[PDB]
Amino acid sequence: DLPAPLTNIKIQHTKLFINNEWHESVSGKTFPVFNPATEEKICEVEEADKEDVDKAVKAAREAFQMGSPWRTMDASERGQLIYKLADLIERDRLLLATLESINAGKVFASAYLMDLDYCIKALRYCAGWADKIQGRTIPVDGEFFSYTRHEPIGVCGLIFPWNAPMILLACKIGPALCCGNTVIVKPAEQTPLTALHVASLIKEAGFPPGVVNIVPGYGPTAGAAISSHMDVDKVAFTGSTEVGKMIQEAAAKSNLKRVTLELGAKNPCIVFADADLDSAVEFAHQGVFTNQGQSCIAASKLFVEEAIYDEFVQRSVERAKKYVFGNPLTPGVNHGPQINKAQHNKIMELIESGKKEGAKLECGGGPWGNKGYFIQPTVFSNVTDDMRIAKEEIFGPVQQIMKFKSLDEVIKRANNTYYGLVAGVFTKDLDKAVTVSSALQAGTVWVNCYLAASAQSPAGGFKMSGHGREMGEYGIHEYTEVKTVTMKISEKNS
Amino acid sequence: DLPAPLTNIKIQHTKLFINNEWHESVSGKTFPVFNPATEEKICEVEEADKEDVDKAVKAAREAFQMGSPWRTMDASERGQLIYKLADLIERDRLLLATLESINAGKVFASAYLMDLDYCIKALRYCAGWADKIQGRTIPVDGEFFSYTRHEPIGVCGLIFPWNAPMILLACKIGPALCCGNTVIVKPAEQTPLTALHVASLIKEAGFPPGVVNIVPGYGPTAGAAISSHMDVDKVAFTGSTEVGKMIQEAAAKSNLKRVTLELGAKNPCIVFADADLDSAVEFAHQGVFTNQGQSCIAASKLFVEEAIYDEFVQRSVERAKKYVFGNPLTPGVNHGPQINKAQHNKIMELIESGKKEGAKLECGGGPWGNKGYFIQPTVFSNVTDDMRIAKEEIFGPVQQIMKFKSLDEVIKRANNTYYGLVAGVFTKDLDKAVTVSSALQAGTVWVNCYLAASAQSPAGGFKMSGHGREMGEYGIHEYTEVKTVTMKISEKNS
Amino acid sequence: DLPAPLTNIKIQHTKLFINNEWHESVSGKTFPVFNPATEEKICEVEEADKEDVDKAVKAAREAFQMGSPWRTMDASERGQLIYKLADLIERDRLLLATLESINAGKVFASAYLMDLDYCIKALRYCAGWADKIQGRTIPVDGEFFSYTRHEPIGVCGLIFPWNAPMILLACKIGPALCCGNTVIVKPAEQTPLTALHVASLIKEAGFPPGVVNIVPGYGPTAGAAISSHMDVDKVAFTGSTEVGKMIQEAAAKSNLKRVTLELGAKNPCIVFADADLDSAVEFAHQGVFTNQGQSCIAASKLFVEEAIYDEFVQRSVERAKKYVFGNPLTPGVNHGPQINKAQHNKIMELIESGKKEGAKLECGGGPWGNKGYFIQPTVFSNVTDDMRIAKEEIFGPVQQIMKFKSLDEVIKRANNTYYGLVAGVFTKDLDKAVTVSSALQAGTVWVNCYLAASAQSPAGGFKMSGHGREMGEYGIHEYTEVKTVTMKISEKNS
Amino acid sequence: DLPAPLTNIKIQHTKLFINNEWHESVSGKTFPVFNPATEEKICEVEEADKEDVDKAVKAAREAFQMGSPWRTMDASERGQLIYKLADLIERDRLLLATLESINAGKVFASAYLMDLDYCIKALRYCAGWADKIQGRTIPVDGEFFSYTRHEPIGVCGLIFPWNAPMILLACKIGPALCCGNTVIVKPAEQTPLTALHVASLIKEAGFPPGVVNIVPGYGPTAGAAISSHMDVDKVAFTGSTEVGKMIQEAAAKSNLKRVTLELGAKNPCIVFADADLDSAVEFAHQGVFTNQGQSCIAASKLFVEEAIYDEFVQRSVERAKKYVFGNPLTPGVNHGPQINKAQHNKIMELIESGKKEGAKLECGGGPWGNKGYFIQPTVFSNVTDDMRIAKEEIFGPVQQIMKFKSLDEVIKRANNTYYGLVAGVFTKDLDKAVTVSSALQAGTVWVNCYLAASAQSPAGGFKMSGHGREMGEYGIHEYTEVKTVTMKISEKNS
Ligand SMILES: NC(=O)c1ccc[n+]([C@@H]2O[C@H](COP(=O)([O-])OP(=O)(O)OC[C@H]3O[C@@H](n4cnc5c(N)ncnc54)[C@H](O)[C@@H]3O)[C@@H](O)[C@H]2O)c1
């Protein structure tokens, strides 16, 4: 069930969050935050720079020192505290979802029923792992007792984008904290507000001071002070591919801090003639147009077998005409705006290029209205491999539909790309499903569904979509460091 | 490729194997061993009894004492000794496959190409696991360091049937020895011979005395001495269901020793209309007619969907006439005899119930030849759930073809049984393949194949087909005993 | 930390709990429940026999049918419900502790601070495993995709004693529910009351009907009907070795249900001369005398090195003199009664046997008061291996103190026993700690502490103290059944 | 007993190995290779540059294509190929040890008894892991079947140093090959000859062509072509810290390939007052002076407690005089040369900074012999924290003995460094052993031993000693990439 959004929500939390207290920027500067549906200023937030980052890192190092309350408390206690944070986010679910909507342009129902729900579930999952992270006893050669410890890494920097502020934040801090690390959080400059509200709940939940620090700010300033800091042990980064290159570089030229990258995507989704046609049209559609295309996991190219091609295209055009734009808080609106003017412009350039290079425009292709950064649902057929809308990430409401003839061809083309985050496959045949999913070079493959991400399963990129995994067993374990202890004993019995 | 079999084998090993030496029996009694194809006595073997088992248990307890060679040896050295046993069985492959054919009635091609091949790779799978058995370090509540050790259990008794002497022996002593246990092997009275040759290979490979002891003999004497012994820690039994119930009670009345059981089977096999019919007919045919039906994993209930049913019965009867009985060492022969008269009588008494209860005989139904215990490849149509031939394990070359009309009803009918060792499912629909194999109450389900076991997978019964698993990670780890050590420490840090 | 007990608690729940409803017994019979400190009847409780168990089993079997809410529910959702049960138990903590005190004779501050706390922590641990139980994908030989599933077993009978009612209950239903089983709970006839109150919280928590059924009653009636039932898939039993023999047998002669056993104990405790003496005396004291010795993990035999023997004994006797017996709800009382006349007399026969066989009585050795089943804390010195107090489990406030001289001797002596549940070792030396703890034949070994069980550590017996483990990763996985699925594929790539 | 070295070995293999064929360099240039004990030339070796790397990468890619022999062979068969390579190195043990001594200046007894033994065991361990690398089946939210695959990554560049050619080669090709990757091997320019002989044995074992390619050459040319290649999926580097940063950077600006890093070291070793002093001097001496200081795992800083300091010093000086320098091949020699002139220079630079900074020269401190790159075993006492000899890696026969008094101060001091590969602790106390080893920030901690590396445990850096681990379960799994496959099903039951 879905409540009504808050009518007169007020912004309360705008300061930096360091050592469980609220700080002004060292410089005294603030930066503005805009509603993308109206273009108007919501508020100004304290702007973090290198000198604020230094303060956050000192506090996180102190919280991590041997004998501190966060290091000596039972693993199960780390767990209870993460589970309590989940309880408070659930209690404030209406507030947090109204605020996601205002700041990031998300359809309200989507933000309440999906984003907030996934964020609460990710934290609860992670909470359960805290006392079940285990090492090994090893029957090594020789007269030794040998074992391993999965220890916390230390101080972790968490840097991420604007498209899903609550989910992104949950899936970085959840794994980090349940392994016992302390953290420095740098949310995207476009959408800092829900991150700062979660900070007020971290103090309420009873986290020790310095365990979680949240410093809103820009990229070359705050983001780059974290990646090159000499006393940060790890940075987990989600964002664009070009910036991930700068992060790896920064890490190398400073202290060789561990790096995790989750970067750009152009995700293929393949529909064979033997697929359930209706279900695939619907899933592939939601694949591309969810959050107005503003999603790393969206279906960006649609390979559709020749016999069902014309009929797939026709049904996708019809499905795309069922949208109403406006303020995402208004009931009856299911198409929000793009995040800002820069993004809007990148999307329109690519749309325009598709017309230029001779893809066929089926519907949309233009901006929507006069105010707010709205773009029409846009579908393109007769798309060929070497067009720009086929290669470049659009991050907008733009579907590409292409023809394919045989199986071995469509695998070749779906893999002919420097990206590899996610891929779809639709077929009701057992052997086809298994062998094609194995053959696709992507870290997640969805069979007969799309957007089916869960907390229990690891997700991440092949190739230039990044390295490392988030969530599941495997992803949680990436916030640990392994130590082997090997002790001499006087006699050894098996 | 297939060599020719040995034409005149010297039987060298007929004595009990205890502490790496050969012993006559305490009583002096021997028992005869017969070739099922010719009825001729191959040799007499030394008959072990309670007092011989008593000797064997003392040798295995001595070999398991702390400070002994077998306990102080590096785990990777144990694995190396098991790899060496496999190399020695491989050098003697031709000899062992001939001997298995002569004693067990196994068609030479199956025994050389499948049984010896599987037995070799099984010991090699287990060899690798030895230095990879690992416990845990655990972040327990309180100021403690806690870990587990997966120790060896102790002295293990291993009792098995006659249907596949080399495979059964490998999958029991492989796992048991890789975890560091000592063992008392009790092969079937019908087929003790190959196991005695393996004894001579264990010796030359260099296993410490008393680690492996073999004592051939009868069940109510030597077997019962093992299950009832106050100093045997675990018994692993493969055999009939009624005998498994005796094992369990004797364990309880003596020393509550650990029990693993692998019992009777009546395995269903379900073929839907959208299956590859050529492939499915052939696989179901292999599954029932492999080893003259003398296999626990044999298909015996063929549920076939009504629209392909008549065709499947016609094609199955045609495949069934491509056979040639005779001495299983003869080139060309692909149908052997059954193990002895008591079993030949039991199969004929079930076959006649088939005629009498209304099933229609499509082919066979009678005895073959003059000498030896041969039975004709028999097929029955129109079989229903109430008939004895659909309820009782036949252990013979007798196919039952049953009809089904719906998915829900046939799952129901395959599950309505106290058996559950194995099952098979033939369909090319992804959804049917996954949902039906999840719904079947059996330890192994094979999809679009049959008789497709591997060393790397675990195997065993649901319900009254047994409890416990053999092979794979999980099955290997069932020959360990878990010990927690928890030590006070002065400070704890994550 | 600790409130005042409820002064006049009123018994609310006394009926059988089946299908989320309160049922009268079929026969009409009800059985009495007594307060062990006054010998007065508290109330009568409904008495289940065979026919009531039969209703419990059909309800558990229906809740476990495919398609049912309990089966189709997500695993994270099972977890949620169990964590909610832990919250309601936390909410009713004072109520359940008063009632535990009254029924079982536990000192109230122990019941509140230790038993209720451990009960809440165990459920929360298990809740966390619900969506982290995982099978494997296995690279088998051949063109196959092969995987395992850790399925729930089915209907589980859960039968336990009277010494820690709330801990026993958590540690059975927690692991079983988190795996997705349904259950029949047969609490001890001495102490059915807190179990029945928990049953009231199962409904409030929102478990589907039939997932948890509670049937109070006696052993040979309610218990034997469960263990011998044809539609119960597993029985987990805790209790006397003699009854454990009967359960194992009943399982054999009914349906070979899986059995797990956690039986009698006589736990050795070794104190070397190079230990923290002060702390060893106090730990060993709490080990013996906590819950008036009515605990399977209690220190019975106390081996103490010759050089420090006389001093250890002086300190132990002095430490045993500081007790005030009386009503377990009364402030300043730290010694409750034994549970009933049958146990009081068992313990008095064994105390008298110590006097007769020549051990030196240091303190106590008789009853306290003339109403209630109180026994003076009792200490024997000069105890030898042949005396009955050194061999038999007493389950009462009686400490045995024995001399030893050499390390190799004391190890033999502590391992010379059919029991093997727990052991203790006290030394400051790394090498002694590790080698002696490896050498002791017990399921748990505590080094420089005692009573240090946690929810994340497995626990269970060697030899005739049982088989199977409870809690930790390993114990939780004993409530699953393993299925291998192997599918034929047209091509395989690594 | 130990055999004598081969008397007049002839170098057989000097060319690049690509596609199981021997190639001349594309330019036709070769580079010289020197015996460090005589200064004399051994042979010239083809010098790979960028154009040669491009050929090897091309062959690896071709050998990794889906459908190829190395992709479609069973995992168990990759294991048998790796095990055959090890049997063959065992057979060529005498030849390979001798050649390792000649090229790497390693004492012969060492090269034969330790290095060759370790390299055979490491390969046999990884062989065991091939068909035991196992993904997961996952109970995710929703109506889905979800599982993971641990696939091979693809083309892996392997770059390493000259201090233990066979060990480093085995510890990288073993984990890489056993997960099913193909590889480009880049041996150090100073010690390529053993790599090349191993390339001949790879061919003989029957590996598919292209699976292992070996391109000897210089670092700025062949090494940097590997790390900058657009078609190389992963680079595992072992070497100096300085060069490790360039690899990380070159990977960023090319294709964001996966990077593993094992770098410089300055390993602490703390010896407490209550330690077995005799054992501790021995292990500590061996720790430093093995390989004449040329091991990254060598002890470099010895912290010795005040009560035993002077005795530790004078005992270490006596131990340092048991050395006879010369050609490692002449009987009696147990002290070999450093590798070349530039290393011989760095070491003496630092030894002379020892004299000038304050430290007391107890023995050695200058060069040895007329010819060769020998240095006297050198011990320093009274060493302080700010000295260059206590901060920078010496990689030579130089022991630093420093004094401490407090457990808390020595831990801070041991951890106050940007390095973190290995550490040592010597004590008889249980509590100090566990707590100090838990507090040290290093990847391996050895307690009451040193140089106790084993194949079954993981090893690698904390901080700027690198990231990633090698060997053991966790190390083997670093040469995989996780793919999640989530399929829609029509019904889900637990
Ligand atoms: N579950 C499985 O993996 C599996 C595998 C192969 C065979 N089987 C079963 O084995 C049966 C055929 O073999 P079988 O007839 O030799 O079985 P069986 O019960 O007649 O004898 C099996 C073994 O137990 C011994 N034995 C007999 N009585 C005993 C007693 N009282 N105490 C101790 N040991 C005793 C026998 O001497 C023999 O070694 C079939 O029912 C088949 O399903 C099961």
PDB file of C-alpha atoms and ligand atoms in Angstrom, chain B residues 159-163 186-190 217-220 223-224 237-240 243 246-247 262-265 296 393 395 421 465, ligand 1:
ATOM      1  CA  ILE B 159      29.805 -52.897   4.476  1.00  0.00           C
ATOM      2  CA  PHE B 160      28.599 -53.095   0.861  1.00  0.00           C
ATOM      3  CA  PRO B 161      26.755 -55.250  -1.681  1.00  0.00           C
ATOM      4  CA  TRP B 162      27.914 -57.183  -4.754  1.00  0.00           C
ATOM      5  CA  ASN B 163      26.486 -55.146  -7.640  1.00  0.00           C
ATOM      6  CA  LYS B 186      33.487 -56.064   4.610  1.00  0.00           C
ATOM      7  CA  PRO B 187      32.750 -56.816   0.927  1.00  0.00           C
ATOM      8  CA  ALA B 188      29.761 -58.912  -0.152  1.00  0.00           C
ATOM      9  CA  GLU B 189      29.939 -62.691   0.225  1.00  0.00           C
ATOM     10  CA  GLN B 190      29.130 -62.977  -3.493  1.00  0.00           C
ATOM     11  CA  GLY B 217      32.568 -63.175   5.127  1.00  0.00           C
ATOM     12  CA  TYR B 218      28.785 -63.419   5.634  1.00  0.00           C
ATOM     13  CA  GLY B 219      26.526 -60.702   6.948  1.00  0.00           C
ATOM     14  CA  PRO B 220      24.876 -62.136  10.096  1.00  0.00           C
ATOM     15  CA  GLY B 223      28.877 -57.752   9.261  1.00  0.00           C
ATOM     16  CA  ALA B 224      26.975 -57.995  12.569  1.00  0.00           C
ATOM     17  CA  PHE B 237      26.376 -49.438   5.025  1.00  0.00           C
ATOM     18  CA  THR B 238      25.249 -49.835   1.422  1.00  0.00           C
ATOM     19  CA  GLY B 239      22.711 -52.614   0.865  1.00  0.00           C
ATOM     20  CA  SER B 240      19.130 -53.793   1.315  1.00  0.00           C
ATOM     21  CA  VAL B 243      19.438 -55.096   6.544  1.00  0.00           C
ATOM     22  CA  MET B 246      19.329 -54.229  11.506  1.00  0.00           C
ATOM     23  CA  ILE B 247      22.532 -52.171  11.260  1.00  0.00           C
ATOM     24  CA  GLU B 262      22.390 -46.236   1.371  1.00  0.00           C
ATOM     25  CA  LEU B 263      19.400 -48.494   0.890  1.00  0.00           C
ATOM     26  CA  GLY B 264      16.803 -49.839  -1.586  1.00  0.00           C
ATOM     27  CA  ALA B 265      15.598 -47.856  -4.618  1.00  0.00           C
ATOM     28  CA  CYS B 296      20.588 -49.128  -7.330  1.00  0.00           C
ATOM     29  CA  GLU B 393      12.666 -53.184  -6.317  1.00  0.00           C
ATOM     30  CA  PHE B 395      17.005 -55.572  -9.423  1.00  0.00           C
ATOM     31  CA  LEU B 421      17.514 -42.530  -4.320  1.00  0.00           C
ATOM     32  CA  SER B 465      16.402 -44.992   0.474  1.00  0.00           C
TER      33      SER B 465
HETATM   34  N1  LIG E   1      21.681 -46.653  -2.041  1.00  0.00           N
HETATM   35  C1  LIG E   1      22.660 -47.124  -2.801  1.00  0.00           C
HETATM   36  O1  LIG E   1      23.626 -46.243  -3.285  1.00  0.00           O
HETATM   37  C2  LIG E   1      22.778 -48.579  -3.193  1.00  0.00           C
HETATM   38  C3  LIG E   1      23.844 -48.967  -4.010  1.00  0.00           C
HETATM   39  C4  LIG E   1      23.978 -50.297  -4.396  1.00  0.00           C
HETATM   40  C5  LIG E   1      23.055 -51.233  -3.952  1.00  0.00           C
HETATM   41  N2  LIG E   1      22.023 -50.847  -3.148  1.00  0.00           N
HETATM   42  C6  LIG E   1      21.051 -51.854  -2.685  1.00  0.00           C
HETATM   43  O2  LIG E   1      21.640 -53.091  -2.314  1.00  0.00           O
HETATM   44  C7  LIG E   1      20.674 -54.121  -2.469  1.00  0.00           C
HETATM   45  C8  LIG E   1      21.330 -55.325  -3.146  1.00  0.00           C
HETATM   46  O3  LIG E   1      22.497 -55.720  -2.450  1.00  0.00           O
HETATM   47  P1  LIG E   1      22.546 -56.970  -1.421  1.00  0.00           P
HETATM   48  O4  LIG E   1      21.419 -57.885  -1.667  1.00  0.00           O
HETATM   49  O5  LIG E   1      23.942 -57.460  -1.358  1.00  0.00           O
HETATM   50  O6  LIG E   1      22.233 -56.324   0.008  1.00  0.00           O
HETATM   51  P2  LIG E   1      22.252 -57.233   1.340  1.00  0.00           P
HETATM   52  O7  LIG E   1      21.468 -56.481   2.350  1.00  0.00           O
HETATM   53  O8  LIG E   1      21.663 -58.625   1.033  1.00  0.00           O
HETATM   54  O9  LIG E   1      23.808 -57.310   1.820  1.00  0.00           O
HETATM   55  C9  LIG E   1      24.621 -56.150   1.849  1.00  0.00           C
HETATM   56  C10 LIG E   1      25.850 -56.304   2.747  1.00  0.00           C
HETATM   57  O10 LIG E   1      25.444 -56.374   4.103  1.00  0.00           O
HETATM   58  C11 LIG E   1      25.841 -57.614   4.680  1.00  0.00           C
HETATM   59  N3  LIG E   1      24.855 -58.131   5.657  1.00  0.00           N
HETATM   60  C12 LIG E   1      23.791 -59.001   5.474  1.00  0.00           C
HETATM   61  N4  LIG E   1      23.174 -59.197   6.669  1.00  0.00           N
HETATM   62  C13 LIG E   1      23.821 -58.468   7.614  1.00  0.00           C
HETATM   63  C14 LIG E   1      23.631 -58.280   8.969  1.00  0.00           C
HETATM   64  N5  LIG E   1      22.652 -58.889   9.601  1.00  0.00           N
HETATM   65  N6  LIG E   1      24.455 -57.457   9.701  1.00  0.00           N
HETATM   66  C15 LIG E   1      25.489 -56.817   9.067  1.00  0.00           C
HETATM   67  N7  LIG E   1      25.677 -56.990   7.706  1.00  0.00           N
HETATM   68  C16 LIG E   1      24.866 -57.797   6.993  1.00  0.00           C
HETATM   69  C17 LIG E   1      26.087 -58.540   3.499  1.00  0.00           C
HETATM   70  O11 LIG E   1      26.948 -59.601   3.819  1.00  0.00           O
HETATM   71  C18 LIG E   1      26.611 -57.584   2.443  1.00  0.00           C
HETATM   72  O12 LIG E   1      27.992 -57.363   2.549  1.00  0.00           O
HETATM   73  C19 LIG E   1      19.526 -53.538  -3.297  1.00  0.00           C
HETATM   74  O13 LIG E   1      18.359 -53.397  -2.514  1.00  0.00           O
HETATM   75  C20 LIG E   1      20.064 -52.203  -3.776  1.00  0.00           C
HETATM   76  O14 LIG E   1      19.106 -51.182  -3.912  1.00  0.00           O
HETATM   77  C21 LIG E   1      21.864 -49.545  -2.757  1.00  0.00           C
END
